Amino acid sequence: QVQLQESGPGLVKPSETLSLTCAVSGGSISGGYDWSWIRQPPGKGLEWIGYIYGSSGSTNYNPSLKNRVTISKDTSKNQFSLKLSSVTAADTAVYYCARPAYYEDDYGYYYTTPIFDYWGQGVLVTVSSASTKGPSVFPLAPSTSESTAALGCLVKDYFPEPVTVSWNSGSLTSGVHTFPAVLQSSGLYSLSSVVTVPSSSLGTQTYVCNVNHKPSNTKVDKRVEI
């Protein structure tokens, strides 16, 4: 099972250096692959950043990045990494690491560089001069009105994105809806996550929302009671 996983700070101040790593499992980083970084500004298109070739160390970068980019690799950790210096708002994006696959063409060759067959989940990096702010979590307590009940958690006044919410440590997945965040005039985000449950279960079942705001290294498990 070849798997890639990005990690790194979600907030970077303008003119400083964005630094990200991609942990690779299910395969050696020394494989003959163009270990690649691709980014996507929220609501916009894909942009290729570059690669490091696992079996040589050779690199190639998008000239749009103008000598700001370094891609490295670490065999002892089985990872490769990205450094992007002198960032601006144009560098705010979800950053993906990706690996090609081998498909033989009509002449017997593999052209791997533009093939992105295995992708990481992506990590949002916001370039902003504003400070990190952890969320306050409040319970949202309760065609239909009361055969099922919507209960939730309001994740209030955080920065930057993202926040993830699960319910009962991931044991509760049916009927869960985590909404896209609102950006309030304060410059802080809020979101709401709601699970719709049988109203009978409000007594016999405890409901906990597991909020994670990685940019502030903060987790909150909030019990939602009626």
Next chain:
Amino acid sequence: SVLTQPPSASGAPGQSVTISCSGSSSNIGSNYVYWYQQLPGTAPKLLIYYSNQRPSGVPDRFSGSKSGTSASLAITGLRSEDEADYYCAAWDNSLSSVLFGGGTRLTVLGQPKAAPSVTLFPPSSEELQANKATLVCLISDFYPGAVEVAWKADGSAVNAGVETTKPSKQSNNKYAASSYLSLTSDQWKSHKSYSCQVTHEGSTVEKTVAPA
């Protein structure tokens, strides 16, 4: 040197659509073209490689071609599940870079209207202890993706403190949005009721809460 795609495309269910990608001799004119499909909130997936080949799991409804300095993705037997952003990609010999087209958002026509489901929450007693009161109005499963949200205090239109998200496409091809009325605790208790009114395709759904 860029790859140019029309930003939008559409087709009817069961019919076909073609998505174009325009480049130059240094990228499409001399290299393979690749296509990627991206559903909402997910990473792109390889759809076409070497200009006309499909990886495992891609139906033959999807086909690719290239001629001169342009390439085309054709999709037949269109289904609502095909709504996605489609990107072309190619190596450029001049820039020594992978180029992406700007992406084409595909709409499948004829999808039926869906009225929003609306859920309204009063402030929690925990927030009220901090002298604040946020009312939360959650709006889901509506189609097409455009709503108007109005707030009422004792049936009078509220102006201050309203913030409403843009609609976002759900995994089921319908849309979701949310609206927030940020009050102080004093303002919340000062009226008998508050309402969130959601207008969609000329009809409205309104929920009311009252300080108990």
